[PDB]
Amino acid sequence: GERETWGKKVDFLLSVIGYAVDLGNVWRFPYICAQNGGGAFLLPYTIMAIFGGIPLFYMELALGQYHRNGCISIWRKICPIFKGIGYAICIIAFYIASYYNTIMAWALYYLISSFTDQLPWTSCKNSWNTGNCTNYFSEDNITWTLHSTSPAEEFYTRHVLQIHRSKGLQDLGGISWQLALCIMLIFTVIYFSIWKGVKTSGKVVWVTATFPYIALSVLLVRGATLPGAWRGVLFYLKPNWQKLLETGVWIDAAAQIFFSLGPGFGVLLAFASYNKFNNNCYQDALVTSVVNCMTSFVSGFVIFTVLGYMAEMRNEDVSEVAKDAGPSLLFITYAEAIANMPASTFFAIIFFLMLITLGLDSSFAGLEGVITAVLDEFPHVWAKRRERFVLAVVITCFFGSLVTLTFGGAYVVKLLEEYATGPAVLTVALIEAVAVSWFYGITQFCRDVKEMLGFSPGWFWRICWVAISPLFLLFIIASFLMSPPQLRLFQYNYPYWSIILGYAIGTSSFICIPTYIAYRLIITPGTFKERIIKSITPET
């Protein structure tokens, strides 16, 4: 007969926040904020949110609580030809889960290695360090060399990641068993949180969504007490209005807020599917989004206080210390900064554990959307038991992550994360944004919102759904396709054919939507206008 619901408004309410907040919120926003105008970057970051992020978040969050269907079956009730979207996302997920969990595997390998009284990345006297390794509490006057490296950089480079054993994308095998065990433990800890459905995913979230704020608070006070921490805050908030004249920083902010809210994937759809019908969507979306951003904002301080202390301990010019723009900012710089502090074991454990808890809920939701859709598309053909399908997805994701668990894995993380998944999710999100507003009709949508909330949404939101949001995604997609960024990681420049590979992985994800449009269009009899009429009209 019917489906299930939420145990309490909060669990989903948090749960969606647990989905939105992640690692990107922690390290990605502070960097892009600092190098693009500093505090001035706060101006275009909000404009791209209010006009572009919020309407997509709310528009995505409403349909899920209205139709109460998955990512696939909701198209059968709107535009069946676009039903392939629901499949595409699935395929997309399979790629996403291939690298998103390996980062948590790194953080976990760091966590289990943070139970020793003396932290590994502090000394150079190890079995993975080289002759270049030079640490502190050593001879003074030391001068850095082009070939010299830090014990933290060695620890990340040559131990956990073990990237020195690979020459790049060409030769990256073999596979590391340690990170395999870690990612197995993680694939187990996400299993016991989803297998019981939305009951546990709203209960486990309680721990995974609240801990990062406590950790950020501790690291915030700690970083605030650190000497010379005002340099990172200064560099982090120093107004550079000239940056606003560049047409690039606006695109950067747009992509940033779009990715942070992560609408148009069906996760919000699935989370909204299990909720009250007369329940509000406006306040929910608004509050959640404002948290995701604010959280990023304070995370900026948490990062740049410690990086300010790091620049103070070195020689200023914070940008120098924050030259790297990736996990190295957390696994090397921030880690090495933690190692030189009292109770370093504590601040390390809470940090890596913070990372794990930061990714876990996002994984919960990420898989949750796909599982919900598939079960809703194949009902009771599926849903006979949930642990069977969930496990079947988890294992497949594990075998799909073996490519990432290799020695040359981070390369594949960059390649898949930037050249494959990102334009594809933006693309399918564009197809959704166009499909809901121009095919199903924005008027009928406002009528549905008028049914649920009791009142029709304002002109401000309608005008955003009609033209502002599709052009919002359009600007990002066009900007990327017109000029794909040159990839670089760990003193290694990517080959020219890399973009060929990523696109190849990108295009091969949505192959189901045009061929599915052709499927319906080749299945439905009569004239093409009649088939398209049955493909545009919702199901009698």
Partner: antibody, heavy 119, light 108 residues
Framework: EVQLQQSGPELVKPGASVKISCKAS????????MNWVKQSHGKSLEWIGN????????SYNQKFKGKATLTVDKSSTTAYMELRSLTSEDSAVYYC????????????WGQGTTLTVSS | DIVMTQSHKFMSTSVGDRVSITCKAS??????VAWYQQKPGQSPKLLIY???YRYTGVPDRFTGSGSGTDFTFTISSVQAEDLAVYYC?????????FGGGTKLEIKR
Amino acid sequence: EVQLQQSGPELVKPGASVKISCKASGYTFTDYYMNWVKQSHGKSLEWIGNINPNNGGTSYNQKFKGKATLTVDKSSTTAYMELRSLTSEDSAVYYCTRSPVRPYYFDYWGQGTTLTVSS
Amino acid sequence: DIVMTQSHKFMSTSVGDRVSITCKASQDVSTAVAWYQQKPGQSPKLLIYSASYRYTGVPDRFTGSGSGTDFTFTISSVQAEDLAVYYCQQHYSIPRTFGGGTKLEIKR
């Protein structure tokens, strides 16, 4: 015995180009950044830019972007700086100095190169 | 960028007198300031790095001090061969900038 031997004086007509060399010795060439400093007659020192000998990692100044071109040769451990669109302002003394990664000081300098841009 | 300002273009001193040159920066620099010596007709020679530290092959009569924006280069015993132009240079932010230069003339 760290020695940096540059090239001799160069007299060139305005609008043309000029290349200056920099032979390094007495140290591991692939260990340190190679830099070039412009000094006008009676004026102060002016950091043009550096280059990483390992891969030719160049890093220029905004004031010299599109004015100077730095190259390097590991086979003979020699750095090069090329100047195009020469004017009377370019008539100055140029140095090539070695520098580590951190702290970024200029420990060893070349003897200098007197450039004269005139017809 | 960063502007290293040297107010005194010229300074007079006698053999054996205590002389000190000041270096003013744009923003805070903390530790990183280097002092170079350039004799007339020669290339600049590194004397001081990181505010106070001395480089190898430098006499004990050359000292450095300061922490922030204002820095001080101190010579206790001025010799006849200490006649040169002294520069101060920051080394934290890109690009690296120098100072005006103080031509230390000797009074006798």
